[PDB]
Design an enzyme around this catalytic site. Sequence first.
Site, PDB file in Angstrom:
ATOM      1  N   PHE A 167       1.298  -2.660   4.670  1.00 48.99           N
ATOM      2  CA  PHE A 167       1.605  -3.959   5.549  1.00 48.99           C
ATOM      3  C   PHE A 167       2.951  -3.591   5.145  1.00 48.99           C
ATOM      4  CE2 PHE A 167      -2.688  -7.294   4.325  1.00 48.99           C
ATOM      5  CZ  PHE A 167      -2.596  -6.284   5.007  1.00 48.99           C
ATOM      6  N   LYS A 182     -10.546   7.877   0.557  1.00 47.41           N
ATOM      7  CA  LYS A 182     -11.229   6.491   0.396  1.00 47.41           C
ATOM      8  C   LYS A 182     -12.639   6.368   0.452  1.00 47.41           C
ATOM      9  CE  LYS A 182      -6.241   4.498   1.271  1.00 47.41           C
ATOM     10  NZ  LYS A 182      -5.911   5.125   0.908  1.00 47.41           N
ATOM     11  N   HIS A 209      -4.114   8.999   4.676  1.00 50.11           N
ATOM     12  CA  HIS A 209      -3.833   7.344   3.916  1.00 50.11           C
ATOM     13  C   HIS A 209      -5.555   6.592   3.890  1.00 50.11           C
ATOM     14  CE1 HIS A 209      -2.729   3.497   3.307  1.00 50.11           C
ATOM     15  NE2 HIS A 209      -3.446   2.707   3.834  1.00 50.11           N
ATOM     16  N   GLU A 222      -2.747   7.309  12.819  1.00 48.79           N
ATOM     17  CA  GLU A 222      -2.754   9.047  11.726  1.00 48.79           C
ATOM     18  C   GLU A 222      -2.602  10.008  12.082  1.00 48.79           C
ATOM     19  OE1 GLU A 222      -4.068   7.856   7.938  1.00 48.79           O
ATOM     20  OE2 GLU A 222      -2.467   8.509   6.620  1.00 48.79           O
ATOM     21  N   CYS A 256       0.797  -1.359  -0.188  1.00 48.92           N
ATOM     22  CA  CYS A 256      -0.341   0.109  -0.408  1.00 48.92           C
ATOM     23  C   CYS A 256       0.564   1.176   0.171  1.00 48.92           C
ATOM     24  CB  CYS A 256      -0.986   0.069   1.140  1.00 48.92           C
ATOM     25  SG  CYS A 256      -2.013  -1.532   1.056  1.00 48.92           S
ATOM     26  N   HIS A 263     -10.665   1.447  -1.065  1.00 44.90           N
ATOM     27  CA  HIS A 263      -9.088   1.359  -1.314  1.00 44.90           C
ATOM     28  C   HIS A 263      -8.325   0.310  -1.739  1.00 44.90           C
ATOM     29  CE1 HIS A 263      -5.131   1.091   0.515  1.00 44.90           C
ATOM     30  NE2 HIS A 263      -4.947   0.840   1.747  1.00 44.90           N
TER      31      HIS A 263
HETATM   32  P1  LIG Z   1      -6.874  -7.699  14.541  1.00 42.27           P
HETATM   33  O1  LIG Z   1      -8.236  -8.169  14.532  1.00 42.27           O
HETATM   34  O2  LIG Z   1      -7.084  -6.206  15.677  1.00 42.27           O
HETATM   35  O3  LIG Z   1      -7.194  -7.232  13.536  1.00 42.27           O
HETATM   36  C1  LIG Z   1      -5.701  -7.621  12.417  1.00 42.27           C
HETATM   37  C2  LIG Z   1      -6.598  -6.201  11.740  1.00 42.27           C
HETATM   38  C3  LIG Z   1      -6.446  -6.943  10.309  1.00 42.27           C
HETATM   39  C4  LIG Z   1      -7.624  -5.748  12.063  1.00 42.27           C
HETATM   40  C5  LIG Z   1      -5.549  -5.035  11.802  1.00 42.27           C
HETATM   41  O4  LIG Z   1      -3.846  -5.130  11.666  1.00 42.27           O
HETATM   42  C6  LIG Z   1      -5.301  -3.796  11.298  1.00 42.27           C
HETATM   43  O5  LIG Z   1      -6.788  -3.282  11.133  1.00 42.27           O
HETATM   44  N1  LIG Z   1      -4.598  -3.554  10.454  1.00 42.27           N
HETATM   45  C7  LIG Z   1      -5.251  -2.164   9.346  1.00 42.27           C
HETATM   46  C8  LIG Z   1      -4.218  -1.644   8.083  1.00 42.27           C
HETATM   47  C9  LIG Z   1      -4.658  -0.842   7.180  1.00 42.27           C
HETATM   48  O6  LIG Z   1      -5.163  -0.376   7.669  1.00 42.27           O
HETATM   49  N2  LIG Z   1      -3.017  -0.945   6.613  1.00 42.27           N
HETATM   50  C10 LIG Z   1      -3.881  -0.246   4.554  1.00 42.27           C
HETATM   51  C11 LIG Z   1      -4.055  -1.366   3.932  1.00 42.27           C
HETATM   52  S1  LIG Z   1      -2.718  -2.327   3.461  1.00 42.27           S
HETATM   53  C12 LIG Z   1      -1.659  -2.369   2.374  1.00 42.27           C
HETATM   54  O7  LIG Z   1      -0.653  -2.856   2.377  1.00 42.27           O
HETATM   55  C13 LIG Z   1      -2.582  -3.599   1.700  1.00 42.27           C
HETATM   56  C14 LIG Z   1      -0.652  -4.572   1.037  1.00 42.27           C
HETATM   57  O8  LIG Z   1      -0.785  -4.204   1.106  1.00 42.27           O
HETATM   58  C15 LIG Z   1      -2.242  -5.951   0.393  1.00 42.27           C
HETATM   59  C16 LIG Z   1      -1.205  -6.791  -0.170  1.00 42.27           C
HETATM   60  O9  LIG Z   1       0.531  -6.944   0.026  1.00 42.27           O
HETATM   61  C17 LIG Z   1      -2.361  -7.882  -0.405  1.00 42.27           C
HETATM   62  C18 LIG Z   1      -1.572  -9.054  -0.822  1.00 42.27           C
HETATM   63  O10 LIG Z   1      -0.706  -9.316  -0.502  1.00 42.27           O
HETATM   64  C19 LIG Z   1      -2.989 -10.062  -0.727  1.00 42.27           C
HETATM   65  C20 LIG Z   1      -2.821 -11.278  -1.713  1.00 42.27           C
HETATM   66  O11 LIG Z   1      -1.226 -11.794  -2.295  1.00 42.27           O
HETATM   67  C21 LIG Z   1      -4.087 -11.427  -2.098  1.00 42.27           C
HETATM   68  C22 LIG Z   1      -2.882 -12.525  -2.986  1.00 42.27           C
HETATM   69  C23 LIG Z   1      -3.665 -11.833  -4.543  1.00 42.27           C
HETATM   70  O12 LIG Z   1      -2.986 -13.470  -3.106  1.00 42.27           O
END
Ligand SMILES: *[PH](O)(O)OCC(C)(C)[C@@H](O)C(=O)NCCC(=O)NCCS[C@@H](O)CC(=O)/C=C(O)/C=C(O)/C=C(\O)CC(C)=O
Lengths: 349, 72, 417
Positions: free
Chosen positions: C404, C340, C308, C319, C167, C345
């Site tokens: 992530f 968003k 974000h 944030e 992201c 997103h």
């Molecule tokens: P607990 O219940 O508290 O849960 C944790 C959570 C998930 C609720 C907590 O971690 C959380 O709320 N996190 C917030 C995450 C966030 O707001 N960040 C913004 C979006 S993230 C962006 O980086 C998405 C991303 O990075 C996605 C990927 O890399 C996607 C994949 O890997 C998807 C795949 O592989 C699918 C596939 C094709 O295999």
Amino acid sequence: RKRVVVTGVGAIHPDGNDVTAIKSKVIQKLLGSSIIRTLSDFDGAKYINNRLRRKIDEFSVYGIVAVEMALKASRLDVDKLDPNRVGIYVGNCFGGWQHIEDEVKALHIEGIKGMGPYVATAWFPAALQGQLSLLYGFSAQSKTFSTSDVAGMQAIGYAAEAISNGVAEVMLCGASEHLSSPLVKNLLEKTSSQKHSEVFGEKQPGDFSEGAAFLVLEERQHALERGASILCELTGFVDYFAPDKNTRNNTLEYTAELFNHNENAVFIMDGIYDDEKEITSKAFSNKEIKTSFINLRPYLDNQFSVSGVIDSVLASSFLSENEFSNTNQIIIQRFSNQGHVCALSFSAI
Amino acid sequence: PEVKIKTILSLFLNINIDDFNMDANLADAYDMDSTELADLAKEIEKEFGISVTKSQFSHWETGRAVLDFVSS
Amino acid sequence: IINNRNESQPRRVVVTGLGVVAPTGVGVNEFWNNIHNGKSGVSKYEWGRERFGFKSGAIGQVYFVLKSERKYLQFALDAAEMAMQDANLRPSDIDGRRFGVAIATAIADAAGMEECLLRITKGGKENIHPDLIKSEDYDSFDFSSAATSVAKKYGASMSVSNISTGCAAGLDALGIAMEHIRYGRADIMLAGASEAPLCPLSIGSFEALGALSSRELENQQAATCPFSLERDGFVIAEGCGILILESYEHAKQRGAHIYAELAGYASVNNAYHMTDLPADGMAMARCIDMALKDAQISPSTVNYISAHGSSTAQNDINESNAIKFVLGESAFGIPINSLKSMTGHALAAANAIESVALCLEIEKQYVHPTINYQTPDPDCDLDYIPNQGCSYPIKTALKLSSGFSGIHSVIVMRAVD
Ligand SMILES: *[PH](O)(O)OCC(C)(C)[C@@H](O)C(=O)NCCC(=O)NCCS[C@@H](O)CC(=O)/C=C(O)/C=C(O)/C=C(\O)CC(C)=O
């Protein structure tokens, strides 16, 4: 700007599970349908925690074990390093299919219940970057590249640029791949062999391999102050593209400028395509260059993002001391199918 | 049974079965997160053969809490 | 050098062209008009609930059986065409060796890779059949399809790359592009991110993780409502954003229109968790400082923030606390927003779509609202421009990103004179 040096290296391969074992077999082979070679006598429980391993893919595993060797080789006291001044650069193309394959198939037959919470975290290529940041706590600018073939080459190059501009004092740059899982296995066994490049031409016969390779790049003064054993200095990086065959020749002439008219140099070539020898020599002849050509690709195999890096770790080992002796500069080149031209330059002290 | 559950959490959290207390809070004691809770909830669906909503497994603070759930 | 000295000294980077493909609009005219008014682009969808049993009911779509539509590559070529036309370069201006590309993505052609797997295994029932694997399938595993295709079309002979930082990949593409121009490597640079994750493999991965919004709603557009108590996760979307970055020196010579300056860039790892974001927001706060120090601009001048705002409960707190840490009591005066709320997103594409939005905001001196703002959250208590947008004199703007692997990324944008 600032100067960048290699203080440590580490890698794993079907030839060997360390830098010394790989280099020994490379010398031996150099002196005297496609398949996917796997690691011999490898056990990831020997390195990584059981709670963590069950979350991550083999490509993340191979990367973690690679940096551990590289950090150990560099003799860095991790507790003394400022985490704000250390970053992580990674190259990875295929991701982590082994961990999510069965769940992807299961999601169609079962439903949501077939899928678990680690599909998103395990598969994406930047997962290795994050797992390394959790384990070691490194907090500086950390990128992941997934450019076809060249991902790991860009990872090293731009890690050096980051150290040069003063983003970090130390950088963990490298690459990791896992090609054993059924989906990527049957793909590479069939499709990848018969494919050809529009720019570079037909591919040479060869196998594929999996594993990882990593370097510990750091700032020169930071290395000298702590009394580190420097392997070699990263003197240059090239990153260009060739949309057509006209630009191809002109692009290779920029790789020539990386030599600095040095007669005592060795050129490690890509070794994927047939026509490389002819086109590179013709371009190098225009720039008055006299250098030796070495091809590690038949011995080390096509490892995609790792293929560029695995040359760099070996190149770093020779400069720290068959054909590599009496050489104060090793230049490496890497191509792509779509027409990338990339090259690194390591020089001795 | 609880013996079945106690083995799962022992392997999931990488804890010794003898050392693992059932009444210990999963978040506080063993540093468990919501992601591990979701993965654990999947294994309960797999082995015992039941359905578990996000609202349901959210209240699993303790090892005995999931034992109370799976019973019903 | 006495005679006509020009130095190899840090150059300024400016945005000369914009291209956007998004649920809120296709092209600049449609995209702006909808976000100006505050129209949602979130579509109500059905196949997720019926076929796979997902709790999700909302997606951000631009326009059941699996199809290799190849939208990842389509949106890139669509957006790259719009941006290059908007830039209005001509062969004279474009030096091939000085023109580079940087299109990022989080999952690339996952929709293509998942169609291949299920086709050859016959609905995921049996083992893989080698004979069923076509020659076209290999191209779906290429992460840098968008980067190389766009490079080939416009003749970009300089650095072509694909950053896959999830992201935060969109900003990181703009970041590396900015560095190329600043340090005398490139004159022009095509930068952005493309994403097409509206496929079961991707929606399930997030649905399984708990990242996606799952609460029952009639008005499904309100699923994505950042900085509200009702928020339970992100509404997944697709699209592409492209910026034609080039040097101020190069831009002014050819008589190019300039939207805004791309002043600085910074990135860090929080080293906290792979998906969780800390309440403290220390890393994001530190990243803001570094971006401003890179830009050589004071935090006092920061007039507007484009956050974000994923709509997950953890990120909106992260944030809010991060902005308060770096700016202090001044954070309450400063307007903030999340696109968003409208666009959804789109992973790596969200950063580049919002960057296109940010350039239009700076040019027209207007700020879009955060729609679907229902009940104020105690923890998220800054000004988020709820529902109604307005004219506002933007001087220095921050664009925040999270993702992530605990990655934070910031850029400092600035009006040109
Ligand atoms: P607990 O219940 O508290 O849960 C944790 C959570 C998930 C609720 C907590 O971690 C959380 O709320 N996190 C917030 C995450 C966030 O707001 N960040 C913004 C979006 S993230 C962006 O980086 C998405 C991303 O990075 C996605 C990927 O890399 C996607 C994949 O890997 C998807 C795949 O592989 C699918 C596939 C094709 O295999």
